[PDB]
């Protein structure tokens, strides 16, 4: 029934999972989220996550879309990404061309702090750290971005809009109740159609709060409260991928 | 055009949520004073238990520090952690003397809350069999503390057994997600000698020996023993000086590669495992082993 | 041969059944919800011109006394005395002397019977708990034909959750939920069995171990067996007083049945407690010579899923009955019915009327409100949950209209139709008793509290206790369509 | 839309009327119950005096007691069955236990020996 | 949009107005409100306020209700109240009579913390403290209970339910945007048909948040956040209205 996830309810429901932000950064966010939302002409802007660096100066990353339309069977959102070392001032994350988008997936290890860092890869190729961060955010968003099913609907002119009459998802424990963001409302694609053991759901029947954690990307959490229909998600931790999933499970 | 998820008719609470209700009641009982309960068959009140006299640390204070740093659990969970520590230390059946909150381990079905406590009467440790590395008795380097683990704050609280060098050596070989329950096979190969609880205890041992620290100069190391006496002349550093890793030191003894804090040498030659010499007791975090270099 | 009680009362040819080889079972089972606390109920006392026509002595006792075995024996002995006097006056011969000896024998029998009658009449006045409202309610219920009872009450989730899943202090006695109900039912059982019949009234208990407690989790299997043994001992102390718990021969008299209700299966499996209760239900032979006599005559289970019931069968546990929720509008557990039909174990059906919500009222009424409160129902939030599971108040209105039409077709209350539907599916009904001028309201009858309107008749109707159903094929089709 | 508002109001009024009708029917039933109970209480003394089948008091004895009560009344108010019975038990001719015994014998119904042919 | 007001949102937006709760009480509410909600059949149960006492054990009062009907030309919410001294255990707050409330009105100053006290009034009368507390709470509840206008709507069977298609109050810096819950949705009676100087409204247009303070009862605060479309009200202080209001304006 909600139209945009709160930044306070997300931090409250995901505090236990370690998805927390500093109090000073929380106040700075509360002040400087609308400023960037108006400076960029975006109708929706929410905090996407927080990535750890070799310094204490983690990257806070917020995403925001202005239009969201159906295109070749994919719900394409025209997202813009912004980063900030502190909660006050935001900078932009320019998209990455395919050559460097493939030369950035081979660079591993947790990032440094200064976004003006050049990695050198193999003749030597110089790649900016902001490109690597953009690649990691794109990979996590492709693999993970999760919303409850039927929470979006298709109107005339083929635009995906929130379902104002969404009554909630029965059986919140089941993974079938949740879907990726880029799945069309008509298609019956959910997280069940992913790999069998890559999503863990723990549901408290009493308080009516379900919690979905990504095991392929260990730092992605998504909560869904059903008594009042409120769902949110956050990624906290480094952006690296968990390759050896078969051994761990 | 009727939308897909028009309406649903569910009961107020699912009929299969007794466990969640019990966990919620246990966590709510942490607050306030226990109201006196009158006995059945009469109106005489049942006298409450005489509490135990224990020792602990400031949990609201370090909850505030961790909230200011933006790490750890929420400030609404550190208060419940304080109350759970108080309940554990207040119980008479399991007599503790000091309590401390270790942390929280995630899992695929439940999570583990861990408290490290010393008891007023250590239990019995079976003697090490022949041909194996001798076990460290209670109070020594690896078994100084006895750990308690629960699923939800408050509620039931089991005691993890001791840890043997075999378990520590076997834990360094495997890499698992914790299923969340305490009776679960860790691995078939590499073989692990025990169920989930033994793996959790070995992980706790390694983490505690690796990542439990105190500000530099707070303690003084015993000249010939391995004890730390509080330094009376310690002058605190202020502000961002406690962000540099050179100003911290390891509060617990280094865990050797053998599976013990101190190597056990056979009596005559020795292998290189037995000649494993470690660092000074109060070892600075600056003089630590860096991670291997990555591709970038 | 049919049940004599049900023969005279309803002209029913139904033969009496037996839950176990020793204990019988009534066609309908009474779940007993206390209206108030046991402390506020065990303290009630019936003891308050030269003639009071409204005094309880001339009104309640004359009815409660004629129903006792000594008085019936006295009347029968007087009848035989008058008869044999008639024949001995007629005969006047050598056989008249033997017949006069028979008259003297029946005279001394009359003497001792009258002494017992005076004894029981005095026993009426020297105890306060007798002749109260609730005691009379249960006495009338038992005399109606439903002699079996079931301890129950407000339960998860509509009750105090600290009294279920809370940690008691160490000094507390080992008393669990549904405690005072056992004491009240035991008091009623002892009073009724003193008035009439040695074992007339049955009683089926309920064991609800708090598997989430610290002691249960940290203890293990020895803790579980100790806990169930302690519960059995306390239940024996409740049903039978400290005196009389053992037979004069020295062998303890066992309980009738213990119902195990499990809260969570992924937390702790019920195998140890089931084995312990089985061992308490069996007597350990030694050579032959009985040792460790049985304390429980049988074991039943509550609301276990079909797979768990099958797993309990596969472990040798002698399960004798299972109670599930299966009404004319709720059919969520069909597999359990088939499994019990295959393995030949009785099944009990709680619900049926959705808590009195299929009554004459609510036909066009708005949904009941918890904060405002409804008193004709037993649990308002439970009734709303039943409504939501049915689908809504509109669907319930449609179903109730259909049921009311079916009822008016024959001339029965709208609830006997649901109860007969439950009986037709094989399961035994489980109706909640009603209190305090609402007596017999669970069967639909109204204004049945006073003797002036009832005339001693039970607040039930014959078609419910009948071997042949009164539901025609169209009615069966409609009720099946209700779903 | 105006008609929809009117129909919604009418439906709500109909449900409220149904609730009120049920309440008043219950009240009427309770009142009739009280009337029956009061009538029975009023009737009881005459019943226990002159219509019990196991005769607590013989007709001659009760009529003699009533005549004596009338004589003592005229020397001084009208005789009442309750007054006659109360005076009779104060005289001691009829005890409470006899009343209870005869009433229980009657309440036995057809099973009573009086209803038995002999 | 929202189904129920969120306690953390209320405490976050009313922090400036001085309506605050202690940390222990906050956590205890978080863990204990659902338990009492599910113990009864109440679909809704939320914190109503915090009355100050003399010993130091403040009275936390919560109210709940199941269904919201319309009857005799008004919205009649059948409410039930609970009180507590600590956030853990909730006890019932019994309703009082009429003459008992008239006598309630004559007790001034903050009531003491102990719920076993008795006040003496005048032939002498004994007034329990719980009766006084309930009298004050019902007085404040009757006087001021704000929801944004047309945030609810009628339906079939004539029950006042939330309006899932609520567009948002237009011009929310004015009292015509807010209304008492008892006022029916269709009717035009709003927060402007009462006295001219017993309500104050502050508005931040950039963040789009409105704060409505009651001046008749100086402890009643309300927020409406337009971007999230979330509203909520709280009371902090003793249940005394300032009769000397005119000299204050």
UniProtKB/Swiss-Prot annotation, chain B:
Entry's localization field? Cytoplasm, Cytoskeleton, Flagellum axoneme
Entry keywords, A to Z: Cell projection, Cilium, Cytoplasm, Cytoskeleton, Flagellum, Methylation
PTM description? Probably methylated by PRMT1.
Q: What is its main location?
A: cytoplasm
Q: Which GO terms describe its cellular component?
A: motile cilium; radial spoke head
Which family is annotated? Belongs to the flagellar radial spoke RSP4/6 family.
What's the protein name?
Answer: Flagellar radial spoke protein 6
| Species lineage | Eukaryota, Viridiplantae, Chlorophyta, core chlorophytes, Chlorophyceae
Query: Fragment boundaries within the full protein?
Result: 52 to 357 of 459
From Swiss-Prot, chain C:
Question: Which Pfam families does the record cross-reference, listed alphabetically?
Answer: Aldo_ket_red
Is Oxidoreductase among the key words of this record? yes
Cytoplasm recorded as keyword: yes
Keyword terms, alphabetized: Cell projection, Cilium, Coiled coil, Cytoplasm, Cytoskeleton, Flagellum, Methylation, Oxidoreductase
- One GO term describing the cellular component: cytoplasm
Indicate where this protein resides in the cell. Answer: Cytoplasm, Cytoskeleton, Flagellum axoneme
Q: How is it modified after translation?
A: Asymmetrically dimethylated at Arg-162 and Arg-331 during flagellum resorption. Probably methylated by PRMT1.
- An MF annotation (GO) of this entry: oxidoreductase activity
Source domain of life is: Eukaryota
Q: What class of enzyme is it?
A: oxidoreductase
Its EC number is 1.-.-.-
Q: Which residues carry this modification: Asymmetric dimethylarginine?
A: 162, 331
- Name the SUPFAM superfamilies for this protein: NAD(P)-linked oxidoreductase
Residues forming coiled coils: 72-124
Query: What family does the entry list?
Result: Belongs to the aldo/keto reductase family.
What the protein does comes down to: Flagellar radial spokes contribute to the regulation of dynein arm activity and thus the pattern of flagellar bending. They consist of a thin stalk, which is attached to the a subfiber of the outer doublet microtubule, and a bulbous head, which is attached to the stalk and appears to interact with the projections from the central pair of microtubules.
> Which PANTHER family does the record cross-reference, listed alphabetically?
NAD(P)-LINKED OXIDOREDUCTASE SUPERFAMILY PROTEIN, NADH-SPECIFIC METHYLGLYOXAL REDUCTASE-RELATED
Q: What is this protein called?
A: Flagellar radial spoke protein 5
Species assigned in the record: Chlamydomonas reinhardtii
Underlying gene = RSP5
